[PDB]
Amino acid sequence: KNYARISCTSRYVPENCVTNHQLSEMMDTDEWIHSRTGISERRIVTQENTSDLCHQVAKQLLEKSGKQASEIDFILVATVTPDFNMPSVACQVQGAIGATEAFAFDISAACSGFVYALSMAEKLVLSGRYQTGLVIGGETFSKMLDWTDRSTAVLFGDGAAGVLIEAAETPHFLNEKLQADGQRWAALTSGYTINESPFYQGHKQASKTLQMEGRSIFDFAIKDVSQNILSLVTDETVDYLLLHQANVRIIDKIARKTKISREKFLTNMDKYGNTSAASIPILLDEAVENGTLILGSQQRVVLTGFGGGLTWGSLLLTL
Amino acid sequence: KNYARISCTSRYVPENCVTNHQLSEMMDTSDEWIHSRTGISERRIVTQENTSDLCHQVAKQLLEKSGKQASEIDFILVATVTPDFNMPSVACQVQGAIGATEAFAFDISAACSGFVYALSMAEKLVLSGRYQTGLVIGGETFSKMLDWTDRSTAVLFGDGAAGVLIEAAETPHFLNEKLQADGQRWAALTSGYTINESPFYQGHKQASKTLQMEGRSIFDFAIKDVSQNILSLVTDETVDYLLLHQANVRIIDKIARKTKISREKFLTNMDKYGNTSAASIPILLDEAVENGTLILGSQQRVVLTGFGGGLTWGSLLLTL
Ligand SMILES: CCN(CC)S(=O)(=O)c1cc(C(=O)Nc2ccccc2C(=O)O)ccc1Br
Numbered sequence: 001k002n003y004a005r006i007s008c009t010s011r012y013v014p015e016n017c018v019t020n021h022q023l024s025e026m027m028d029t030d031e032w033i034h035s036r037t038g039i040s041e042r043r044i045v046t047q048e049n050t051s052d053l054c055h056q057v058a059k060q061l062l063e064k065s066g067k068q069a070s071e072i073d074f075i076l077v078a079t080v081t082p083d084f085n086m087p088s089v090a091c092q093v094q095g096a097i098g099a100t101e102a103f104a105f106d107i108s109a110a111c112s113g114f115v116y117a118l119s120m121a122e123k124l125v126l127s128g129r130y131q132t133g134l135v136i137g138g139e140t141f142s143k144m145l146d147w148t149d150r151s152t153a154v155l156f157g158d159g160a161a162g163v164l165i166e167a168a169e170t171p172h173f174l175n176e177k178l179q180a181d182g183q184r185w186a187a188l189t190s191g192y193t194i195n196e197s198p199f200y201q202g203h204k205q206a207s208k209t210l211q212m213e214g215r216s217i218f219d220f221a222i223k224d225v226s227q228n229i230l231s232l233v234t235d236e237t238v239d240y241l242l243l244h245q246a247n248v249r250i251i252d253k254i255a256r257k258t259k260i261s262r263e264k265f266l267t268n269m270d271k272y273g274n275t276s277a278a279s280i281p282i283l284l285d286e287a288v289e290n291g292t293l294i295l296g297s298q299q300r301v302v303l304t305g306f307g308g309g310l311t312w313g314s315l316l317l318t319l
Numbered sequence: 320k321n322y323a324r325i326s327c328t329s330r331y332v333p334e335n336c337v338t339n340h341q342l343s344e345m346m347d348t349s350d351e352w353i354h355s356r357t358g359i360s361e362r363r364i365v366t367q368e369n370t371s372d373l374c375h376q377v378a379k380q381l382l383e384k385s386g387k388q389a390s391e392i393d394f395i396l397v398a399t400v401t402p403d404f405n406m407p408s409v410a411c412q413v414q415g416a417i418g419a420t421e422a423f424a425f426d427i428s429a430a431c432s433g434f435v436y437a438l439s440m441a442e443k444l445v446l447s448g449r450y451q452t453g454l455v456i457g458g459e460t461f462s463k464m465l466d467w468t469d470r471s472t473a474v475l476f477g478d479g480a481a482g483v484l485i486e487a488a489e490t491p492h493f494l495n496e497k498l499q500a501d502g503q504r505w506a507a508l509t510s511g512y513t514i515n516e517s518p519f520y521q522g523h524k525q526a527s528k529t530l531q532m533e534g535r536s537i538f539d540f541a542i543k544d545v546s547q548n549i550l551s552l553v554t555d556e557t558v559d560y561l562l563l564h565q566a567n568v569r570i571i572d573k574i575a576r577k578t579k580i581s582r583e584k585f586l587t588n589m590d591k592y593g594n595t596s597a598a599s600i601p602i603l604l605d606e607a608v609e610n611g612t613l614i615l616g617s618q619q620r621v622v623l624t625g626f627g628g629g630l631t632w633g634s635l636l637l638t639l
């Protein structure tokens with residue numbers, strides 16, 4: 001019994017809802033934002049940090065699935081906006097829910113973090129040493145954004161979602177391709193921390209607040225992510241695709257390039273905008289609560305993420 | 320042929336070298352004060368390199384020493400809690416600088432247990448049959464995260480990195496592992512907080528990024544929980560050497576006594592490097608291979624055990 005499947009899904013975002021309207025009044029930018037990106041509103045934290053969000057997801061997953069915290073063999077969080085560098089968010093969550101038996105760590109892979117982490121989760125299970133784990137992508141990008149730069153401030157939201165993953169009799173994780181190219185890392189940065197020790201003599205002026213090269217990542221998505229997807233499926237072999245919800249125009253393009261039915265690409269960024277590592281799991285959980293996807297349906301679903309790094313990767317799983 | 324094994328090791332620390340003598344003039348205290356407390360004589364401190372650079376060198380050296388081509392690498396894991404950016408990972412930055420164009424890459428956050436956590440992870444990856452060659456580097460630039468006025472913590476840490484090449488093998492090398500965590504104590508050991516000053520945030524948080532360390536809580540923690548962790552894998556009979564996080568030799572002394580394992584088997588490293596966090600074990604590992612103390616493909620029973628922020632701890636039992 002070596003195979004793994006997703007056994008439960010859960011999401012949690014902050015109740016504070018911020019509209020393009022609100023952001024524009026505040027910024028001076030009207031809903032060219034929506035036609036530009038497919039975004040209408042995101043959720044923004046007013047009191048929560050990232051562990052607060054991931055906690056909720058962890059708590060909900062235990063509730064809905066009816067497992068004890070002590071069943072969890074491990075907890076991976078894919079974030080790039082953790083409360084601290086140390087402790088990891090996962091350790092904070094692991095404490096908060098009393099999963100005494102779990103080891104936990106965070107995975108740093110930007111918008112690919114949830115796919116990378118679900119992939120690593122699958123390996124931890126295939127080994128036979130671990131049966132049950134929680135994988136959660138969570139992010140509070142609002143504390144990284146320079147809110148007076150309308151270029152990006154409008155793009156990102158805060159949120160969190162994840163899944164419970166347990167061992168199974170039959171395979172579900174069918175294939176995967178994980179890729180990266182740090183020869184283009186310049187294109188999407190955040191969270192630089194400046195060394196001001198008495199011994200440091202560099203005066204590097206990297207930003208602490210997020211910064212992206214808009215044209216580069218966009219171009220990178222269409223060409224590279226499209227090839228990565230086609231590396232796993234054609235239209236005949238996939239039923240749905242949950243892509244990192246970073247821009248609806250990317251979704252459109254990737255669909256035409258890949259010749260995969262546009263209908264099959266679920267969308268979400270209208271309500272949540274770009275929540276990075278959280279984006280796929282949020283979408284996933286909505287689609288399940290919508291009734292679009294059903295655990296055990298055997299629907300053929302590919303999850304594909306892409307973002308800073310640069311990183312990208314796809315999973316083909318039968319649900 | 321799906322068993323990970325360590326096929327090569329290497330390490331890199333900045334050139335700038337800060338002796339107790341120096342800190343003691345700096346911090347206005349004595350040579351002996353520093354030494355008595357830490358058990359350390361000198362340690363390396365960056366002056367122009369970030370974690371990504373220290374890891375770069377490591378990867379670079381593992382490539383040259385193993386005579387492997389970067390294009391052969393399938394994955395790069397970096398254990399670090401002091402990255403250049405949160406995004407991109409140090410792992411990716413390294414992956415760019417060495418043209419490992421075929422490898423995917425990410426960071427693992429698990430503080431002073433990172434290397435062990437990460438090594439464990441590479442085993443699963445290789446074990447799956449999807450990947451055969453990977454770099455697993457622990458590197459840390461913790462000097463940027465200390466209040467250098469405080470002789471209490473700042474005299475403890477040094478910078479640097481070091482890691483291993485892992486390759487697929489016919490015969491299993493990784494025998495047993497136990498990874499543990501206790502987030503109910505995460506307050507004990509913290510760094511790198513980052514305050515939300517968004518226009519929407521109405522919370523009220525102070526936030527030195529500078530480390531906060533509850534000394535005796537984590538000292539007693541290490542002596543108790545680590546010991547029990549080490550014993551669930553081996554006893555004195557079934558181990559040749561143990562590579563532990565180099566936090567403070569007195570922890571290594573007390574743990575030896577609890578486990579009832581020969582003290583000479585616990586390799587020790589800290590005089591000249593100080594506490595290098597995720598770096599500590601893989602640097603100890605490369606020195607020991609220099610000495611010839613450890614010999615690759617000898618079948619020496621070895622256990623690498625880490626413990627640190629989280630709280631995290633964990634041990635790998637592998638055959639060298
Ligand atoms: C030609 C596209 N341009 C406007 C429609 S844009 O470059 O300004 C732009 C371009 C992107 C983009 O390509 N984003 C990403 C691409 C890959 C991975 C992650 C992202 C992300 O936004 O997180 C998002 C928003 C805008 Br506005």
Ligand SMILES: CCN(CC)S(=O)(=O)c1cc(C(=O)Nc2ccccc2C(=O)O)ccc1Br
Nearest residue numbers: 356357431534535537538541566567569626627
């Ligand atoms: C009672 C112990 N005291 C002096 C012997 S101490 O708190 O100053 C101290 C206490 C520790 C310690 O307990 N460190 C750790 C414990 C668990 C995990 C990691 C570490 C680490 O320092 O990396 C290390 C050095 C000193 Br000096």
